[PDB]
Each structure stands twice: as C-alpha cells, then as structure tokens.
Amino acid sequence: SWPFWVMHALGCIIDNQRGATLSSSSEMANFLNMFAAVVYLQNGGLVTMVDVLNKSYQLCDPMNECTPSLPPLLTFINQVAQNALVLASPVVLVLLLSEVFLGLLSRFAPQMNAFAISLTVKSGIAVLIMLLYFSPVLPDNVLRLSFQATGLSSWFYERG
Amino acid sequence: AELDSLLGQEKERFQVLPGRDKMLYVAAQNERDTLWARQVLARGDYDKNARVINENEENKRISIWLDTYYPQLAYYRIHFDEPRKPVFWLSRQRNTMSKKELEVLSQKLRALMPYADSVNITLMDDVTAAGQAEAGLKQQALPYSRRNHKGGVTFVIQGALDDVEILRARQFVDSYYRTWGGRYVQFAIELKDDWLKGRSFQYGAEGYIKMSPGHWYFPSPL
Amino acid sequence: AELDSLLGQEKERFQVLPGRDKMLYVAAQNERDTLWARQVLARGDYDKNARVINENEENKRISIWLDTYYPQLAYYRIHFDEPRKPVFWLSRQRNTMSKKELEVLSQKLRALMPYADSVNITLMDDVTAAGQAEAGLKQQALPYSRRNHKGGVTFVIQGALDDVEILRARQFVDSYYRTWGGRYVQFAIELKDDWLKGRSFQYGAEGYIKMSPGHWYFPSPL
Amino acid sequence: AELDSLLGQEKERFQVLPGRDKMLYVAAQNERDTLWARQVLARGDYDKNARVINENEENKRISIWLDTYYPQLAYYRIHFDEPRKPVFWLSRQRNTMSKKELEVLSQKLRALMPYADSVNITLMDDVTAAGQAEAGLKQQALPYSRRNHKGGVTFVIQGALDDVEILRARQFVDSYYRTWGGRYVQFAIELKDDWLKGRSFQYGAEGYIKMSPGHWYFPSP
Amino acid sequence: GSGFVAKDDSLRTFFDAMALQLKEPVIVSKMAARKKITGNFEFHDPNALLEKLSLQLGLIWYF
Amino acid sequence: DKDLLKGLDQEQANEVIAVLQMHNIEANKIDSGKLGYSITVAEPDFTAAVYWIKTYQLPPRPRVEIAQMFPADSLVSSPRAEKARLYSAIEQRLEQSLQTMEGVLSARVHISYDIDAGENGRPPKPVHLSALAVYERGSPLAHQISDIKRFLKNSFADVDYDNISVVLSERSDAQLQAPGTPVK
Amino acid sequence: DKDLLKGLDQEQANEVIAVLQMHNIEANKIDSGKLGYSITVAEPDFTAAVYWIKTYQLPPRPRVEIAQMFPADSLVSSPRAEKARLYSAIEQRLEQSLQTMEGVLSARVHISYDIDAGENGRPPKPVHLSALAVYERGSPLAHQISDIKRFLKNSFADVDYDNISVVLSERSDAQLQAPGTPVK
C-alpha cells in the first residue's frame, strides 16, 4: 500500500493548504487515491501484486521463523514522507507566495481584511496550478513507486 | 614556363609524357593527386594542350572502346608500371586469335594511347588466377565457399563475422584487385546473422549431411 | 648550401647516398625521421634533387613491380642493413629458376634501385622459416594451432588470453615480422569468448546444444 | 675544450673512448645518465662528432645486424665489462662452426664496433645455463613447472602467490636476465586465484571439488 | 570422438545424455534430481563410469 | 545586373552560387551587412536562372531536428518528450561520428522512434536503423557496406543485421572550370 | 578579392583552411576583431572553392554531446535525466583515455543507452560499445585491434566480446608542400 498512501497523503496536503479542513482545530484526497488505484490497476497491476507474495513463500517458508528485518523498517515513515513533500512541492509554493503578495496589499491598504479574500482566491489557484502538471507528471511516479518483487530480500531474513 | 615547374615542390609524384597528337599527358598515381594536377590545368595558367591520366580511369576509358569493337574478348587488366610500354594481360585458355589477329589489336590499342610507343600483349593462365585466390583466401583462415562455373569463379563469405575477420578480408581483396582486377574472380563478402559462418547441415538417421550451397540461411538462436 | 648541414644537429640518424641519375637519397629509419626529412625537402631549402627512402616503404614499392613482371615468385624480404648492397632472400624449394636468369633479376633490380651498387641474392631455406616461428612460439607457453597447407602456413591463436600473454605474444610477432616478412607464415591472433557461452553440449559427430533443461538444438556437429 | 670537461663535476661516471672511424664514444651505464650525456651532444656545445653508447642498446644493435647476415646462430649475450675488449658468449651444443670460421666472425664483428680493439669469443656450456636457473629457482621456494623442448626451455610460475614471492621473483629474474639474457631460458609469471577457499575437496587420482553440499566439479585430468 | 561437457546440470539432463552409449533409457528419481555436476566427461566405457560415479556421488542403480 | 534573391544568409548563398555555377551561368554575391546577402546574374542568364530556382526549390530551408519540437526550456517534460530528446541527440552524434571514417564525405542516420510501448504493459519493440552515405569516388563501394553495419550493430541495445539498411553512392564529378561571361 | 566565408569561429576557420589547402587552392585568414575571422580566396579559384564548400558541408557545426540536452540548471531531475548525464560523461572520459595509447591520433566511442528498464520490473539489458580510431601509418593495425578490446572489456559491468565492435583505419597521405599562386 505504498503508492496509494503517498497519493492519499498528497491530496490531504492540497486539501489542507487551501482552507476547507480548518474545522478540526475529505473528498479530494479520496479522488487521487482512487485515481492512482486505477492507473496502477491498468498496466500490469495484479500480476506484480501476486508476484510479490509468490516470492515471499520462496524466501520466507515457515518452520524457519522469518521476520520483517527491523533495522530497515525504522526509516519507513520518512520514506513515504520525503515522497510526499516533493510531490506536494509546486502548489504550496504558489499558494504561499500568493498569500504574502496579498499581505503586502493589506500593508498598503489597512482595512482590507485580506484574510477573507484568501479563501476565495486560493481554491481557484490550488486547482489551476495543479492542472498544468496533473496530466504529464503525476501518473509516471505512480508506476515508479510501485514496490517490486526484486527488493523482497532486503526486507526479510529467515532465522534458522 | 614549362609544365613540370608549374606543379608542386617535388617533381617526384608526377610524370610528364609527350603525346603523338601534340598533347602533353600528366601521369599521376592516385585520385588525390589527380585533382591536384587538374586544378592547375583548370584555372588555366598554361598556354598549351594537356591532359591528366591515371591508372584507374584510363583502364576504364579503353574498356568502353573494347566492348564495342571487340566483344567476347577474354582479358583481365592493363598495367601501367612503365607508362611508355604498358602490358596487356590477355587470357590464354579462352581466346582463338592467331599471331596475325593479335597484331591488329596491338596496333589499334597503340592508337588509343598516343603517349605510348608499343603495347606488349602477354598471355596468363586461368588456373594460376584461381589458385592464388584460393591460397590467399586460405592463408587468412577465413570461412568461405567456392562456386565454380564456366567463364569465371566466385567466392562467397557470409555469416556473423567478427571484427578481425572483416579487416583481414578487406585488406586482401583490395590488394588482389590491383593485380588482377574483377573480371574473372569476384568476392561476395556479406554480413548476416548466423554463427555457422556460411555452412549448414541437416540431421537425419545417420549423422549429419552437408546440404548444397543455397541462398536461404537459417537465422541463429543462441 | 650542403645537405648534411640542413638536417638536425646530430648527424647519425640520416645517411646521404649519391644516385647515378643525379639525385641524392637520404635513408631514414622510421616514420618520425621520414617526416623529419620530408619537411626539409618540402619547404625547399635545397636546389638540387633529393628523395628520402625507408625500409617499409621501399619494400612495398618494389613489390608492385615484382607482382607485374615476375609473378609466382617465392621470396621473403629485402634487407637494407647496408644501403649499397641489399640482400634478396629468395626461396629455394618453391622456384624453378636456373643460374642464368637469376643474373637478369640481379640486373633489373640494380637498374631499379639507383643507390645500390650491387644486389646480392641469397637462397634461404623453407623449413627453417617455420621452425623458428614454432620454437619462438613455444617458449612463451602460448596455446596455438598450426595449419599447414600448400605455399604458406598459418598459426591460429584464439581463446580468452589474459593480459600478460597478449603483450608477450605481441612482442614476438613484431620481432618476427621485422626479420622474415609476412609473405610465408601468417599469425592470426583472435580474441573471442567461450563459444556456446554457457550451454552444455554433447560434442562429436552427433551433436546437440541444450538451450534449456527441456530444449534441444541440432546445428552442425559440434 | 675537450669532451671530458663538458660533462658533470663527477668525472667518474662517464668514460670516453677514441674511435677508429674518427669519432669519440661516451660509454654510459644506465638510462638516467644516457640522457644526461645526450643532452650535451644534442644542444651542440661541441664542434666535432661524438656518440653516446650503452650496454643494453648496443646489445640490440648487433643482434639486429646478426639476424640478417648470420642466421641460425645460438648465442646468449655479448658482455661489455671492459668496453675496449668485449667478451662474446657463444653456445657449444647447438652450432657447428670450426676454428677457421670463428675468426671470420671475430673479424667481421670488429668492424661493427669501432671503439673496441678485439672481441674475445668463449664457448659456454648449455646445461649449466639451465641448471643455474633451476637451482636459483628452488632456493626461493617457488612453485614452478619446467617445460623442456628443443632449442630453449621455459619455466611457468602459476598460482595465488603472495607478496613476498612476487618480490623475490622480480629480484631473482631481474638479477638473472642481466647475466644471461632471454635467448635460451624464459620465465612466465602468471597469477590466478584459488578456486578452493571455502570449498571441501578430494585430492589425488580421483580429484574433485565440492562447490556446494550438492554440487561436484570433476576437473580436467 | 564423443563426450558431454557439463556446465551446472541437474543429474536428469546429464544421465539422459548417457542413455545412448548405454543402450537403455535412464529414469532418475526426484530426490536424486537435485544434485548438480560440472566438468568434461567422456563416454568410452560407461558401465564402469556409471559405477564409479554412483559411488563418488552416492547413488543406487538397478538394471 | 538583375537581382533575383536578397535577404539571404551565409550558408544559403554558398549553395545558390554552387548550384548556378554548375549550369554555366555566372553569379555575383553582393553583401549588404545587416540586411544579408544578395545575388545578381546577367540579363541573358536571368530566364535560365529563374528556371533553375524553380526546379531546385531554392533557397534551402534550415534542417529540422526532432529535438527542436521539444525544447528543454519548458517547465515540465513528459517521458515521451524525454525519450524523443534523447534519441534526437544520438541521431546527430552518430552522424558526426560517421564523417571521421576513411573516404566518407557526408552521411545521414535515422533511428526508429517508439512511443506507445513505454507506458503500457506491452514489451518494447525491436530497433531499426537506416543510413545514407556519400563516398569519395574511386572506392570499391561494394566492400564498404560491411564496416558500417558492423559499426552500427552494437552501438545500440538489440538490433539485428537485417533491420539495418545502408544506401550509399559516390560523389559527382568535380566542377573546376569557370562558367564564362555572356559576350554580346 | 572575393570573400566566401565570414563570421567563422577559430576552430571553424582552421578546418576550412585545412580542407582547401588539400585541393591546391590557397586561401587567406583575416581577423575582423569581435566579428570573428574571414576567409578569402583568389579570382580563378572561387568557382572550385564554392564546390568544395558545398561538398564538404562547410562550415562545421559544433560537436554535440548528450549532456547538453539535459541541463543541470533544472531544479527537478528525473532518473531518465540522471543516467543520460552519467553515460554522456563516461563516453567522453573513455574517448579522452583512448588517445593516450601507442600510436592513436583520434578516437570516438559509443555506448548503448538504457533508460526505461529500471522503471518497470524488466531486467536491465546488456551494454554494447562501438569505437573508431585513426592510427599513425607504419603500424600493423590488425594486431592492435585486440588491445582496445581488452581495455574496453572490463571497463564496464559485464560485456561480451560480441558486443564490442571496433573499426579503425590508417591516416591519409601527409600534406607538406605549398599550393602555389595562380598567375594569369
């Protein structure tokens, strides 16, 4: 569940930056998770999903006590985190530069209440900037982050 | 001035021959020096008549006359090692011309080359022309196949040859062509993909049998 | 303006021979000194005529004449260790020349080389040209395969040689070509990997290659 | 000035010899001093002609001359320990030259080396040349394999030699080549890795190497 | 004139190549089909080569 | 003294002069500095010069490469636009490496482009190459076709000897003499 | 008198001089300050000089490398954009290392580019090489074709001797004498 987790983490950041989640202190992040589920499912998909559990019996046969090999497990959370932040890189930069560009206009006109205008303009920006790189850039990282069977040796070892 | 001082610094790479029809022939030796002397005669700093000849192209010039006035003639190559008395290598086992008939050809070949004085026609054997080609094709340890038929032979080298067997073969063909010429024996170097370099067998019921040489080849899985 | 002062400071790498047809000859030793002398004669600070000779160039120049006027001749190499008396190494067991017409060859070669005062013709043996090439090839412990055929032998060195056996086999061939020439015996060093690269096979008169534990290939009998 | 003052301050490493062809030969001892002596004669601070000779280069010039005019000759080396009377080491059990035709060789060799006055030809034996190489190769405790054939022998050293044996082998071969030369006996050092490191094997007549608990390897006999 | 050149075979590919010099087909079991072999062999006296290999490898055979 | 082409540049004017001088008409190249070159011919040669312009379709357009339609200055780049920019640089590099062989004056190499296989589950297809060449004359150009196929075969991942096609030809006869001025 | 090229570079000017001096026409190189060099010829040699400009496709283009089309200034860098810049520096370092051998004047090396094999589950293919070389004459160039194969063999991960194809040749005849001035 690696590339679905980072894609669902992508949509939660894009939902959270534009407002729309500040009732705590989601549908958009569900949309990318379904989309990367389908584009993973089309080309190949279940053949490599079955192949990694067919290799797991080739390297973790029971009555041998294999374990999930702890010392590379401890970098798992940041392994998806550094894939989350660089994938959410370009749209939070435009939303953040637009906010301080509006803030200099609030410094040039004091009773503007530019906080109210920020909710109106960010939801258009957060879909517009991601429309330029939604088509040619997103779906190849989905196939790149799919965990392949050759790396199954690095996550396990049998104990006797 | 004179023509042999309007050329380059060394008077060693060219040779100026007097013509019988009041022309001045310049005998170069390769293609790069042929345009060296033709650029001089082309820009026009010489008040008289001159022509630039060469071994490769005046051997092609008097083969157009020969296959108009003497068809079905058996010959190999014309050698210009001494350009005032060239040697005409004629075939012995395939001509019926007598002594009187060879002398009209010797005079009508003198008339095509006005710089020459007399053309010496000599006769070579047809079995030492294919024996030197087979012994040279066997000294390089090259895979080959000989196809004898009437009026010429041909040697065929096929297969997925490696990089050494192309350089040793190509260094030998251009050194054989300068001596004999491609009138009698012709080489057929060609690259396709089969590790059996040319040969092909079929297997049934006793061992292997060598099939006849054919044009189709089996592509190799390996 | 003498010629011996126009060259470099050390007067030991060149040697000027007076020809009989008014032309001085500078005999170099390798290609670097040949270009050192051709730059001098090319810029033109010497008003008389001069030519630069060599050993590898002069040995390829007078084999074109010998492949036109005296074909089917068995010879090895022409040595210029004393440039006024060269030595022609003729073969003994492969020619049919008498005593009289060898003087004709010794006079048509003297008129062909103007710096030479006289040419000496020695008859070298034929089995000592291949027994020294086999005895030198046995001291380096190299695997080889001799192929005897009519009028030339061929030593084939194939396989996956290592790094020291290529340098040791390259130092011997270039020391043999300097003394015997590449006319009679030919060395064929070819570097190729394990044929049938990882496949088990059953060789000899009924052969098959095993492409897989369940796949048979029946090419030519391995 | 004269030539022996244009060289360095140490007037002991070079030795000038007057030639017979009106020259002046300088006899260096190695390649570090031959370029020292040839820089002087090359920049041109000397009026007459001179040359710089060497021990190993002159030992290749008259061997290039010798394989044109005197082929099928069996020799080892010509020694120049005193450069005015050199010593020629001819072989005995491989040639059939009489006394009358050994003076033609000693008189035609004199005209090639103008600095020398005479050449002293001695006939060395042929079995001591290969017996001193075997006894010198056994003293270093080296695995080897002698291959005898007609007109030369050869020694092949193979294996996973360690660092003390690939330094004692260079210190013995470079000390033997200086004396006899590589005409008769030739060494062949080639080092490969050991296929039996963590492997169990059987040695003797029926030898095999167990590359795994379930994998046998029967090598070539 | 004959011989097999084994490069990491599996004792079922191998002993079927000897099934021509032996005039009978060979049937190897599946527990004896896991052992492997390499080497240049030569089938000139196979009834003594099969006996020598069955004791070095560790096998039992019946004809 | 009748101009026919103006506003050209340096590489186009040396091709128009070399084409018109082959067909026995003179030409004058008049530079104009910033405005480019200009070409005039004589008055009896103007009717023939317009005909040779229409037949050879002069002035020549600049040569197109595949990496011009996918420039590197864009903000984003698809994988189709990255493999097309890779193949269009190898296609020029083999062209500049074939001109250093012995006798070849000009050459052009073509590679088969693949787009659809890199995205779906279909395996990639075989690779096809095609080359053209112009040789110096006097060469026996039937034996020269095997060195090019030997060089071009394992300069790529997986090609065969029958997916490469070499077509080559010797250069034309040299033109060295002057055309000549129209006397009247 | 008449100019035929101007605005050339430095290395572009010496190639035009070295080609025209081979065919017995004499040219002159004139500097123009910041506008580069310029090359002029005489009056009767102009017709042949345009013919050798057209045949040899002069002036030469600057040579192209694959790392030029994947610039390092981009803040994003795909793995297709890192392996192409890694291959393009190895096939320049092996080329500069081949010129230090015994008797080699020039060389050109090509590597097989594999970029789309690591993104899917497909295994990487083997790597192929190809090389050209120009040797100093007097060399027996049939025995030095196996030292380049030995050096190029274990400079990579795992190649075979079938994947390496080196084809090389000897240099042309040396040009040392002056062309000569056209008198009229």
Add this chain to the structure above:
Amino acid sequence: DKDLLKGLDQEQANEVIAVLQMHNIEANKIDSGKLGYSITVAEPDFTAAVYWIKTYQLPPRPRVEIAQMFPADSLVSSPRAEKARLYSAIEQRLEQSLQTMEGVLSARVHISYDIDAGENGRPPKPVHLSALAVYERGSPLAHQISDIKRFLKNSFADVDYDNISVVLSERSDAQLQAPGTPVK
C-alpha cells in the same frame, strides 16, 4: 608571421608547441596578458602546421571528470548522485597513487559504475577496473603487470584477476634537438 591560434591558455599552448616541434617546424609563444597566449609560425611552415592541427585535433580540450556533472553545491543529492561523486574521486586518487611507483610517468584508471542498484533491491554486481600506463623505456615491462594487478586487486571490495586489465606501453623516442629556422 601568420597566426595559427590565439586566446589559448598555458596548458593549451605547451601541447601545440610540443606537437609542432615534433615535425621539424618551430613556433613562437607570444603573451598578450588578458587575451591569453598566441602562437605564430613562418610562411613556409604554415601549410604543414595547419595540417598537423587538423590531424592531432589541437587545441586539446580540458579533461573531463564525472564529479563535474553532479556538483556538490546542489540543494539535495540523490543516492545515485552520491556514489557517482564517490567513485569519481576514487578513480582520481588511484591514478595519483600510481605515479609514485618506480618507472611510471602517467597512468589512467577506470571503474565500472552502478546504476540500477541505486533504485532497486537487487544486489550489486562485481566491480571492474581497467588501467593504462606509460613506462620509462628499458624497463622489463612484461613483469610489471603482476605488481599493478596485485596492488589494484585488494583496493576494492572483491575483484578477481580476470576482471582487471592493464594495457601499458613504453614512452616515445626523446626529442632533444632544435628544429631549425627556414632559410630562403
């Protein structure tokens, strides 16, 4: 005084003079301050000097390292762009430690790089080395390969002697005499 090249730096000028003096022509190294150096030859030497410039591909380009394509001043560096900067400094240190042996004057060492191992879970392959060397002449250069293969063997993780290749050669003949001025 015809000018051949101008604007060259210090290391570019010493190779041009070291090449021209090998073929019996001399040059002059004239300094110009900020505009680099300049090299002039005579008029009868000009035709030969422009020929040896084209053949030897002079001026020499600066030598390329793999650590230049991946600069260390970037913000973030991938693991693919970190082992390439490690291996490029190791292969530069191994050829600087080879010049301190006895007899050696120059050396060049190459390592096989890992590409797929940065992104995959596959184990890496064996590392291959390859070396060139130039030895001072007179040395028994046949026995000198066994010391370099022993030194190069255990300078890495695990190699074997079939994966190391040394191709070495003796230096050229010494050039010690002056060319000579062309008198006319």
Add this chain to the structure above:
Amino acid sequence: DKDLLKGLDQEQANEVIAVLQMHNIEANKIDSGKLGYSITVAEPDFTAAVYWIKTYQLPPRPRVEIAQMFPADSLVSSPRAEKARLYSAIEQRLEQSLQTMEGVLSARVHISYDIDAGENGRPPKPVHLSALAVYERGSPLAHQISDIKRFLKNSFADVDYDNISVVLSERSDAQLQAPGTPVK
C-alpha cells in the same frame, strides 16, 4: 630566455625545477608577488624542456582526498555522506603514521570503501587495504614487508593477512651535481 610556465605556486615550482635538473638543463625561479612564480630556461635548452613538460604532465595537480567531495558545511548530512569522511580520515592518519618507521620516505594507503552495505540487510563484506612505500637504499626491503602487514592487520575490525598488499621499492640514485650552463 623564453618562459615555460608562469603563475605557479611554491610547491609546484620546486617540483618542476627538481625534474628539469635531473635532465641536465638549468632553470630560474622568478617571483612575481601575488601573481605566483615563473620559470625561465635557456634558448638551446628550450626544446628539451617542452618535451619533458609534455611527458611528465607538469605542473602537478593538487592531490585529491575523498573528504573534499563531502564538505562539512552542508545543512543536511546523510549517513552515506559521513562514512566517506570517516574512511578518508583514517586513510590519511595511517599514511601520516607510516612515515615514523625506520627507513620510509613516502607511503600511501588505500582502504576499501563501503557505503552500500549499510542501509540494506546484507552483512558487511571484509575490508581490504593496499599500501605503497619507498625506502632508502641499502636496506633488505624483502624482510621489512612483514611488519607493515603486522601493523596494518589489527588497525581495523577483521582483515586477513592476504587481503593486504604492500608494494614497495627503494629510491633512485641521488642527483647532487649541477647541470651546467650552455657555452656560447
């Protein structure tokens, strides 16, 4: 007096003079302030010194250490980028610690670098070393190979006695006498 090189620093000029004085030519070390040093030789001694500059690849480059590729001033440092500095500081400390032995003038040590055996679950491979040394002459340099191995065996975790290779040699003959000026 023609100048060979200029702009060199202190450590380079004492290497160029130490090489030219070995081959019987003089040299002058001229200071220039902040613009470095310069070196001038005589006019008959100019053709030899250009040849030895080209042969010995002079002036020498600064010696590369692996710690120069991974600077300490980075904001984030990987574990991959910290073991390279840790190996490249033990590699310098054993090199500075080998000079304190009896007879050694110079030495160089090479550790086998592993960075890729850390993140995975595979066990780390054994570590190999390789050392060079130069001894003063008059010493039995075959018996002194056993204590460099004894000193290097247990400076790390677990090496064997056959994973270390020491290749050492004695120094050349001493050059003490002056070259001598050319007499004119």
